[PDB]
Amino acid sequence: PSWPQILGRLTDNRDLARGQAAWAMDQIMTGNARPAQIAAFAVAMTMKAPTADEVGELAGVMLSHAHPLPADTVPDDAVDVVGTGGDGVNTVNLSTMAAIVVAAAGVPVVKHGNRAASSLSGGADTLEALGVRIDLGPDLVARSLAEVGIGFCFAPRFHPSYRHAAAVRREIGVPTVFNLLGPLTNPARPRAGLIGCAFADLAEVMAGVFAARRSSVLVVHGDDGLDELTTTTTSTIWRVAAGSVDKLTFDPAGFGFARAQLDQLAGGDAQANAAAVRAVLGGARGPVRDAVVLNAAGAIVAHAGLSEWLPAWEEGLRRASAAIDTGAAEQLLARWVRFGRQ
Amino acid sequence: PSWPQILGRLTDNRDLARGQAAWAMDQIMTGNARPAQIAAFAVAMTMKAPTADEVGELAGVMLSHAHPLPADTVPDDAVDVVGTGGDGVNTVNLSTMAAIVVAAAGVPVVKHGNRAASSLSGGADTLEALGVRIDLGPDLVARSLAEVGIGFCFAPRFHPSYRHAAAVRREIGVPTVFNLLGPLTNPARPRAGLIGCAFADLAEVMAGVFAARRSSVLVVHGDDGLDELTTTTTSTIWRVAAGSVDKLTFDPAGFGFARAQLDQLAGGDAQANAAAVRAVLGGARGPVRDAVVLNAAGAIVAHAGLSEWLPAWEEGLRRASAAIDTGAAEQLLARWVRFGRQ
Ligand SMILES: Cc1cccc(C(=O)O)c1Nc1cc([N+](=O)[O-])ccc1C(=O)O
Ligand SMILES: Cc1cccc(C(=O)O)c1Nc1cc([N+](=O)[O-])ccc1C(=O)O
Ligand SMILES: O=P(O)(O)OC[C@H]1O[C@H](OP(=O)(O)OP(=O)(O)O)[C@H](O)[C@@H]1O
Ligand SMILES: O=P(O)(O)OC[C@H]1O[C@H](OP(=O)(O)OP(=O)(O)O)[C@H](O)[C@@H]1O
Ligand SMILES: [Mg+2]
Ligand SMILES: [Mg+2]
Ligand SMILES: [Mg+2]
Ligand SMILES: [Mg+2]
């Protein structure tokens, strides 16, 4: 394989041969690619329209180079709650809040996360502001998961070889196929998740990658553009189960939720967003709670799919709400903060 | 304007707004674009499908930054004979040989040229092997043109600010929109030309750029893939005159030209291709001579267009053949060599 061969194929609008995307990614992640080659590949793959096979190869190479969690430390039914980001709306940290609630309902959560790329405060930034340790390596994430019920895998900590693509992605600015990879490369490799996708036309491709792994995942795109299940309108859900992908539209009104305005979900800096988390876990009613409960329920539905759509959602909403109302979610965050200080 | 705005528009498969392509090219030419940005732009422009407007903007910026020739030193009827290269056939240097013959026939030639990128020996390489000084500056090119009847503008000498782009292009190794720019950026700005294009689907775009300038040009693509008028089969000609383009099919059988095999036009290294030039100029009969006379005639037809198709060709073929047969073409090369030495 070569860069002229692979780039030529992509610029002729042809799907790559098996292994070529993987060759390319490994060149990038071993530091052997020129910035121009990285850029050309990212842009060419994006404009050609990447396939699930190709994206699966890219994610596969990343996982092959990632720091793994130690053996037998991740429950077979662990779940992720994470998105691509890049929706350009700068909301409160819905995945992060949902993840805490889900863990507090008793579902093991091993969350992939990162700092913001465009938003004011990313999930890692807000957790940091809350006193949660976002710097833990493999051993300690495994202990967090065992002792607290949730572990946070800070992406740069687990994916140091991905640094080689970092400057190039920033310099070109524009989203590419690489913006699909975050949720696909959780180093603990949980088999269930509620996965946000900001890019409506590529969500199906992400879903295809999870289907090839036989993951139980809901890939979600709010029809208002959010990489979350939204409360302002319907959401599109690519449901992944038993290796197949089913496309659905989801309306929260079907479960008694009132329509919200997008500005009701607006975020701010790390301190402002940390305060927003504290308010929801404290039992404040309103639009931010509703969106958290909705997304937590989605994660629980994905979890249930590891082993029907309507009762699953009803049970998910019931469990997410109870996890907040009992105080369990607020207590879990406190215990998480205390685990880190120890 | 910004790289994210422009790259975003292109990856959305949208034509650029007026002036955006020029903005981008000026950033590249001033050393202000990162290699990753250069590469992203080249690839995105190529896959979106460039317009004549866009390519014209890129060319315009290069000419703005190029070393010009001194005022009133280029004849108003000067002609170029040059192609994109990149046809992957590795032939003898047909444009270079044609240019010498055309000049010997009395048509002033200010040739844009460069070393090979893929071939074993490009026009510049073969001229160097013949003893011609290829790297002369504006003042001396102008003197060459007046005293010898031909001048050669070495692209890297006249377009020093293009070095950032040229480097990225070698790194990604695949043809892009930038491979159209050579024939479009002759620093002497001749108004006529015989212009080869290796890319059949983009020749019409090149022709459009020349039309906007109201040049008299034949943009040519051999139906065997050559960026030259071929003798192995028919050629497509985008004839540019009166600011309009019309596409023609051209068969040299109509002028008594026998079919050649592409193998008979095969080239080698600079010394072998220099030998091929000497052989043609020395009056050897055969497929190479035929191909040279045909392309020489084409340039003379373009020159005439600055002012009927078939009579123009007949006159061009007669003048080309005679320029060789009288030894005028051999003697002009000898004078060209002496000029550079003295
Ligand atoms: C995967 C990943 C690993 C290491 C660094 C980065 C980084 O870019 O800094 C990274 N990217 C993401 C990580 C997550 N994530 O959830 O951990 C989400 C999105 C992205 C992204 O760049 O689009
Ligand atoms: C324009 C130009 C200017 C400076 C350098 C280069 C280079 O790349 O080295 C260059 N490119 C070409 C120049 C000519 N030319 O006729 O002088 C022909 C083709 C090309 C090309 O790369 O496609
Ligand atoms: O700056 P952006 O590109 O817009 O990304 C915003 C955040 O979304 C992603 O994580 P995640 O879904 O886990 O965070 P969340 O809690 O805010 O939803 C990403 O890792 C960022 O932390
Ligand atoms: O390596 P390549 O990409 O295949 O290009 C072959 C040559 O063709 C172009 O010039 P020109 O038309 O003037 O040269 P010629 O005499 O060989 O036709 C280009 O500048 C190269 O010198
Ligand atoms: Mg999210
Ligand atoms: Mg989000
Ligand atoms: Mg040529
Ligand atoms: Mg050629």
User: Same domain, yes or no, for B34 and B160?
Assistant: no
Residue pair A57/A190 in contact (Cβ under 8 Å)? The answer is no
Residue pair B243/B218 in contact (Cβ under 8 Å)? The answer is no
Task: Extract the tokens encoding B147.
Answer: 């005293």
User: Same domain, yes or no, for A140 and A2?
Assistant: no
Beta-strand (E) ranges in chain A?
A: 79-83, 109-113, 150-154, 192-196, 216-222, 235-241, 244-250
How many domains does chain A divide into? 2
Atom of ligand 2 at shortest distance to CA of B124?
17
Three-state DSSP at A318 gives helix
Three-state DSSP at A175 gives coil
Task: Extract the tokens encoding B224.
Answer: 């065997």
d(CA A81, CA A228): 10
Task: Extract the tokens encoding A46.
Answer: 């994006």
Domain of A35: which CATH number? 1.20.970.10
DSSP assignment of A95-140 equals HHHHHHHHHHTT--EEEEE---SSSSS-HHHHHHHHT------HHH
Q: Which residues contact A254 (CB under 8 A, 6 or more apart)?
A: none
Q: How far is CA A172 from the centre of its chain?
A: 23
User: Same domain, yes or no, for A159 and A123?
Assistant: yes
- End of a domain among A45, A66, A87? A66
d(CA B204, CA A135): 57
Amino acid found at A68: P
User: Same domain, yes or no, for A225 and A253?
Assistant: yes
Chain A nearest-CA residue for B7: A174
Contact B35 A40 (CB under 8 A): no
Give strand pairing partners of B153. B112
Residue pair B212/B243 in contact (Cβ under 8 Å)? The answer is yes
Return the ∠ at Cα A98 (arms to A254 and A210), rounded to 5°: 85
User: Same domain, yes or no, for B91 and B34?
Assistant: no
User: Same domain, yes or no, for A81 and A55?
Assistant: no
User: Same domain, yes or no, for B80 and B61?
Assistant: no
Atom of ligand 1 at shortest distance to CA of A186?
17
Q: Closest approach of chain B CAs to the CA of A1, in angstroms? A: 13
Q: Could you tell me whether strands B244-250 and A150-154 are parallel, antiparallel, or unpaired per DSSP bridges?
A: unpaired
Domain hosting B31: range is: 1-66
Interface test with B, best of A47, A169, A176, A179 (most B CBs within 10 A): A47
Interface test with A, best of B11, B38, B170, B176 (most A CBs within 10 A): B11
Interruption sites in chain B after residues (C→N beyond 2.5 Å) = 307
d(CA B39, CA B32): 13
Pick from B16, B114, B80: nearest CA to B220: B80
- Residues of A3-38 as b/e, b for ≥16 C-beta within 10 angstroms? beebbbbbbeeeebeeebbbbbbbbbbeeebbbbbb
Taking the CA of A183 as reference, the closest ligand is 1
Determine the straight-line distance between the first and last CA of chain A, rounded to whole angstroms: 50
- End of a domain among B45, B66, B87? B66
Radius of gyration over alpha carbons of chain B, in Å? 19
d(CA B96, CA B126): 8
Chain B nearest-CA residue for A167: B36
> At what resolution in Å was this solved?
1.8
Left if phi > 0, otherwise alpha if psi is -120 to 50, otherwise beta: which for A327?
left
Domain of B309: which CATH number? 3.40.1030.10
Task: Extract the tokens encoding A136.
Answer: 């833990």
The dihedrals phi and psi of A193, each to the nearest 5 degrees, come to -175, 160
d(CA B167, CA B169): 5
Task: Extract the tokens encoding B134.
Answer: 């290829």
User: Same domain, yes or no, for B44 and B138?
Assistant: no
Residue pair A216/A240 in contact (Cβ under 8 Å)? The answer is yes
User: Same domain, yes or no, for A6 and A87?
Assistant: no
User: Same domain, yes or no, for A103 and A192?
Assistant: yes
- DSSP label of B67: P
Contact B39 A40 (CB under 8 A): yes
d(CA B186, CA B108): 14
Return the ∠ at Cα B284 (arms to B283 and B289), rounded to 5°: 90
Return the ∠ at Cα A39 (arms to A38 and A40), rounded to 5°: 95
User: Same domain, yes or no, for B194 and B266?
Assistant: yes
User: Same domain, yes or no, for A19 and A131?
Assistant: no
Return the ∠ at Cα A64 (arms to A134 and A152), rounded to 5°: 15
Q: What share of chain A is helix, strand, coil (3-state, %, to 5)?
A: 55, 15, 35
- End of a domain among B14, B38, B66? B66
A338 is in an annotated binding site: no
Pick from B252, B251, B219, B255: nearest CA to B237: B219
Q: How many CA atoms lie within 13 A of B88 on its CB side?
A: 5
CA-based torsion, A82, A83, A86, A87: positive or negative: negative
Q: Closest approach of chain A CAs to the CA of B86, in angstroms? A: 13
DSSP assignment of B143-209 equals HHHHHTSEEEEEHHHH-GGGHHHHHHHHHH-S--GGGGSTTT--TT--SEEEEE-S-TTTHHHHHHH
